């Protein structure tokens, strides 16, 4: 009976591949070939936050486009004030092995996680004045790799045990779990409408999820190595994934297939983080070659290099209003570019 | 600039706190445990007292050791091994009562992040290895062995195979045989770590 199931799966895969290949009327390059290029994007460093003493793996902007939080390996999560480079908070961590962080859209909470398999929720507006942990979410087997805040209560986390989870901070329980990935899930992004989200795993496949129903809808493949980052298009109907093959790819949700590949024969190091712009025109990716490249999304042409880091950049993210770009690296310095 | 001055003094105070905490925490020495399943890591971490990562810290002759057992992470090693790029030494454990550990040693000794970090090799269950030798020749595990059948030569052969995997001339491998009933583990670790500290500081000064 196993052979029959395998044959049915192969037939379904052939059918879906034929359907996907039938809808490729033209490539994205042939459509956006007649538009003017972006040109040269020369960005100069504006600020520099010299507070950390070890490697940095996470940096998430605030909803007010002024406060930023960075999690480092010194066991400290220091909330920054980008306008004046002022340290406003310094939260010690129980587990110094942290590789992700998030800042709540309301601003009242900060989440962090790592090799301890626990997503810790911190409260920043306590009446006592200090910052204390409010909830310790536990239940993952593999290391937590990413976490985002849907709202002031719920939180979605992508762990390394081939599972993505939906939690309730009020009760501290796994409301909904998602399964289907074969390898470690190393990235997560939530849609602007907070109803859909996607995960980039180490099995070279990107999947789309439903927060409410809890079942997968589409599966995207085409990468040759593990996926390290993911980010929706500002319109919410597309996303881009950066892999360890030194290439970026763009996927269309309605077309259900890849659109463009951002590859250059010069670059060989892997990609650590990706992020769009406010208008979705520029795609900034953080390579392991100590530099950040700017990719024109609609033409796959390089527009400038944000060199200046002494080590590999581990995180990148633009502000909500798009007035600045933050790059965190392993050299303990987070720089605000504009 | 009314209450911005208070913001500046708060920022300077917490920056001073961060610097003081970093200076205080730079004193501790970091060690990384590794090995096969049920290879004897638990025995040595429990002999010194005190699902995710397991941290054990003990002080022995004015040195603050911090062992990071990471055997509980049942995931891909490549995606989190770089977090320990700054450890002083890698404590490697091999069970002599069992081939599968050679691949792990080769992978961990030639990794790009550990080209300059030494490996301290502990061989456990020496009595069990001798009992197996008496019961069966050591050629079952190593079909290419051509020699006598006793404890000493088999131990030397296993040591040679485990040491031949090194390729960088800037790293050293310290080895020791444990009988699972001795308290010399702390002394061996201390004597290896002091030499490693001396070598690291000399190489930093450039005199090495």
């Amino acid at each position, epitope marked *: 009976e196993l052979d029959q199931l395998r044959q049915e799966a192969e037939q379904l895969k052939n059918q879906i591949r034929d359907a996907r290949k039938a809808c490729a009327d033209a490539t994205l390059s042939q459509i956006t070939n007649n538009i003017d290029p972006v040109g040269r994007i020369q960005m100069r460093t504006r600020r520099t936050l010299r507070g950390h003493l070890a490697k940095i793996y996470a940096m998430h902007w605030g909803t007010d486009s002024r406060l930023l939080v960075s999690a480092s390996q010194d066991g400290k999560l220091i909330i920054w004030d980008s306008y004046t480079t002022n340290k406003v908070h310094a939260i010690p961590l129980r587990s110094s092995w942290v590789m992700t962080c998030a800042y709540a859209p309301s601003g009242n909470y900060v989440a962090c996680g790592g090799l301890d398999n626990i997503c810790s929720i911190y409260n920043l507006k306590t009446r006592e004045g200090n910052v204390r942990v409010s909830r310790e979410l536990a239940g993952h087997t593999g290391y937590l790799s990413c976490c985002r805040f849907l709202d002031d209560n719920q939180i979605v986390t992508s762990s390394g045990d081939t599972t993505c989870a939906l939690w309730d901070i009020e009760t501290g329980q796994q409301t909904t779990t998602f399964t289907g990935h074969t390898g470690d899930v190393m990235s997560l992004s939530l849609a602007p409408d907070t109803r859909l989200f996607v995960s980039g795993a180490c099995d070279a496949s990107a999947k789309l999820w439903d927060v409410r129903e809890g079942m997968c809808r589409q599966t995207f493949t085409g990468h040759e190595s593990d996926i390290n980052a993911i980010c929706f298009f500002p319109n919410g109907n597309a996303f881009a994934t950066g892999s360890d093959d030194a290439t970026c790819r763009l996927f269309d949700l309605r077309a259900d297939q890849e659109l463009m590949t951002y590859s250059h024969d010069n670059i060989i190091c892997g990609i650590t983080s990706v992020s769009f712009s406010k208008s979705g025109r520029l795609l900034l990716a953080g390579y392991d070659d100590f530099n950040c490249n700017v990719w024109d999304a609609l033409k796959a042409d390089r527009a400038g290099v944000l060199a200046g880091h002494d080590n590999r950049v581990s995180c990148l993210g633009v502000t909500d209003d798009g007035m600045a770009v933050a790059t965190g690296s392993w050299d303990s310095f987070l720089k605000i570019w504009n | 600039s009314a*209450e911005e001055r208070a913001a500046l003094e*708060r920022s300077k105070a917490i920056e001073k706190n961060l610097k003081e905490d970093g200076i205080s925490a730079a004193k501790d020495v970091k060690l990384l445990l590794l090995g096969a399943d049920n290879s004897g890591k638990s025995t040595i971490v429990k002999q010194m007292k005190i699902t995710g990562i397991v941290e054990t810290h003990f002080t022995f002759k004015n040195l603050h050791f911090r062992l990071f057992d990471v055997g509980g992470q049942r995931s891909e090693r490549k995606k989190w091994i770089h977090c320990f790029e700054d450890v002083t030494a890698i404590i490697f454990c091999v069970d002599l009562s069992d081939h599968e550990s050679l691949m792990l040693f080769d992978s961990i000794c030639n990794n790009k992040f550990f080209i300059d970090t030494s490996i301290i090799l502990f061989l456990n269950k020496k009595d069990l290895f001798g009992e197996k030798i008496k019961k069966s020749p050591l050629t079952i595990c190593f079909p290419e062995y051509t020699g006598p059948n006793t404890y000493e030569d088999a131990a030397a052969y296993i040591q040679a195979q485990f040491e031949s995997k090194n390729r960088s001339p800037n790293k050293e491998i310290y080895c020791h045989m444990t009988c699972a009933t001795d308290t010399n583990n702390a002394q061996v670790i201390f004597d290896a770590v002091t030499d490693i500290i001396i070598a690291n500081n000399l190489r930093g000064c450039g005199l090495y």
Partner: single-chain antibody
Framework: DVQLVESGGGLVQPGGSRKLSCSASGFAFSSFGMHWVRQAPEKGLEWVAYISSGSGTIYYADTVKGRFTISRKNTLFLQMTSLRSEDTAMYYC??????????????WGQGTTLTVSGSDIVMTQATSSVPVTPGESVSISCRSS???????????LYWFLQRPGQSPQLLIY???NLASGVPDRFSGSGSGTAFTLTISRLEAEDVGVYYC?????????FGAGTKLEL
């Protein structure tokens, strides 16, 4: 929860000395700055002294400089020397923490009563009293001698409410934000020098005396107050 109980007042002959101690509990006192605000038995509030976190910066009013001393075990002290007949008042202990988005002067102490036998930004409240019926909207106006809007864009007009026979409570900070724990009916606004605070659906809990305070430069000059009697 939070609590700032204090004692040390009483009857002092002129030329004597005393020591008022503020005991703080229920919060991280080491990270909170502490102020000192007194009030005459019939007049309004007036700033006295201020000490920062870690005893870094200390300030005094022009009329008290040299005579007093502020020092900080979770306890705040106010060394007091050469008491004169003008120093009789009720002294309050006030906490305040300053960072981005912080809420200074959020909590006030119970208070102690003590009985003794040029560059200031002048703030005036023209309306001494306002008779208002319950359920009707009211307004309180304040003025200034200098513009309180700094270059960064934050105005520094603070609004307080003093219920009859009770310690003051923070209502609106930075002339636009609402303090925690106060109902949303309160609202405030202003422009440069003139400030106003509006109340909708007034109830019995809104009866009291409202105070207008600035924070742009020391000394922190208070207002004469507006009495919103029933």
């Amino acid at each position: 929860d939070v609590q700032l109980v204090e004692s040390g007042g009483g009857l002092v002959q002129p030329g004597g000395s005393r020591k008022l101690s503020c005991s703080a509990s229920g919060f991280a006192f080491s990270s909170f700055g502490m102020h000192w605000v007194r009030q005459a038995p019939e007049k309004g509030l007036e700033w006295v002294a201020y000490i920062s976190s870690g005893s870094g910066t200390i300030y005094y009013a022009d009329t008290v400089k040299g005579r007093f001393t502020i020092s900080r075990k979770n306890t705040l002290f106010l060394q007091m020397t050469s008491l004169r007949s003008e120093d009789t008042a009720m002294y309050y202990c006030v906490r305040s923490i300053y960072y981005y988005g912080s809420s200074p002067f959020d909590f006030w102490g119970q208070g102690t009563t003590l009985t003794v036998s040029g560059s200031d930004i002048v703030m005036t409240q023209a309306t001494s009293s306002v008779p208002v019926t319950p359920g009707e909207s009211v307004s309180i106006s304040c003025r200034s001698s200098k513009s309180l809007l700094h270059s960064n864009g934050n105005t520094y007009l603070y609004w307080f409410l003093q219920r009859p026979g009770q310690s003051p409570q923070l209502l609106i900070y930075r002339m636009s934000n609402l303090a925690s724990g106060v109902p949303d009916r309160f609202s405030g606004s202003g422009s440069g020098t003139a400030f106003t605070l509006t109340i909708s659906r007034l109830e019995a809990e809104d009866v009291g005396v409202y105070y207008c305070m600035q924070h742009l430069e020391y000394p922190l000059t208070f207002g004469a107050g507006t009495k919103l009697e029933l």
